[PDB]
């Protein structure tokens, strides 16, 4: 359909298109599938490339083919902040990137970008108490996929997040593919 363009950019520029985030990482426990799938959202289809250049040429190639808009995170220019590791001490949740496993290790950036210092808590009351209750707010997500951002935004739909989190499962089945 359109992923037939996706391989097309992997082919054209052979060693320089890693693929979309779903392919490069996975949530450790089945538990966190719903929280990780809520935090990553659109960035699960966000094509990770090596340079801003290959980024640019991929967008040009796409326009020619007259295909749907894609996002490229260029590892060469991606401007991310270092994970605040002091948050590993919060007595309720744990950082979201500590629950994702990726590979290769150098795409580490694309992850610090999608995740930042996001947090994953147990229930809704907990995610709220430590997102809004502190002097500094923290993006926080509960296991049912309800999100409390630093901006005040709040979101959910536990039933849709559930169906969406099954992509991680079909993705494992392709480890045997």
């Amino acid at each position: 359909r359109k992923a037939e363009i996706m391989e097309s950019i992997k082919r054209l520029y052979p060693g320089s298109v890693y693929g979309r985030l779903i392919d490069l990482c996975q949530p450790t426990q089945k538990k966190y599938q719903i929280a990780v799938t809520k935090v990553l959202g659109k960035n699960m289809d966000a094509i990770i490339v090596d340079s801003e250049k290959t980024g640019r040429d991929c967008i040009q190639y796409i326009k020619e083919q007259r295909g749907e808009p894609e996002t490229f995170l260029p590892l060469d220019y991606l401007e991310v902040k270092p994970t605040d590791e002091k948050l590993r001490e919060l007595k309720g949740a744990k950082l979201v990137i500590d629950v994702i496993r990726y590979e290769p290790p150098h795409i580490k950036k694309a992850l610090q970008y999608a995740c930042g210092n996001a947090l994953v808590c147990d229930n809704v009351e907990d995610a709220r108490r430590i997102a809004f209750g502190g002097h500094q707010r923290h993006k926080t997500v509960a296991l049912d996929g309800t999100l409390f951002q630093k901006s005040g935004v709040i979101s959910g739909g536990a039933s849709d997040l559930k169906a969406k989190a099954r992509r991680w499962d079909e993705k494992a089945v392709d480890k045997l593919k």
């Binding site: 659109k42 966000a46 801003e52 980024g55 640019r56 967008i59 796409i62 326009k63 083919q65 007259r66 295909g67 749907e68 808009p69 894609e70 996002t71 490229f72 995170l73 260029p74 220019y77 991606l78 401007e79 991310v80 970008y113 809704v124 709220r128 809004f132 707010r137 049912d144 996929g145 309800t146 630093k150 901006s151 005040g152 935004v153 709040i154 979101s155 959910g156 739909g157 536990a158 039933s159 849709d160 997040l161």
Partner: protein
């Protein structure tokens, strides 16, 4: 007439309205939770106007933030979800809670090849922090490459009238754009 819009919306996004609406009437038929109905203000797309030259860059800048729901506060925001999830309904819903919103004070560059995208939207000032949240950080740039310069040097997302995007952190977005605010206009025209 009205169905022309919905077709451009996808069952995914629609199910979150149809559902967010069943919860609203449910509180109504039972006569419980008033603060909620007294504090729900509609979606982002039904609460602002802009000139047709900016339909494309405004629409893509916002994607589906176009359906975030303006509500009075965090408590009206949560009660709608509690029941949304309890009734196990087709997600999803995102809330812009007026009582809670926190948007960063930014000054735009005195540049003459870019304009603040928000200075081109008409909206009720009661609803300010919300539109500032969705649009308060994106410029409309003169060319694909001006976007690059500005989005690199300064902390602002950039986008051309034709939709090519470059984020303040490096992300590149682009592709072929066909031809929602459009039909939101046509339908506002009947009523």
């Amino acid at each position: 007439k009205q169905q022309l819009l919905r077709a451009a919306t996808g069952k995914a996004i629609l199910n979150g309205i149809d559902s967010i609406n069943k919860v609203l009437e449910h509180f109504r038929r039972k006569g419980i939770n008033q603060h909620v109905q007294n504090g729900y203000h509609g979606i982002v797309m039904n609460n602002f106007e802009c000139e047709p030259a900016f339909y494309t860059c405004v629409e893509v800048t916002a994607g589906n933030r176009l359906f975030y729901h303006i509500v009075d506060s965090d408590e009206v925001s949560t009660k709608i979800l509690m029941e949304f999830n309890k009734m196990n309904l087709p997600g999803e819903v995102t809330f812009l809670p007026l009582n809670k919103l926190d948007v960063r004070d930014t000054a735009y560059p005195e540049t003459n090849d870019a304009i603040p995208m928000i200075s081109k939207l008409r909206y009720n000032p009661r609803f300010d922090k919300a539109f500032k949240h969705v649009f308060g950080k994106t410029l409309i740039c003169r060319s694909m490459e001006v976007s690059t310069q500005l989005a690199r040097a300064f902390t602002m997302d950039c986008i051309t009238l034709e939709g090519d995007q470059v984020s303040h952190r490096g992300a590149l977005t682009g592709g072929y754009y066909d031809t929602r605010l459009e039909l939101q206009k046509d339908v506002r025209k009947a009523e």
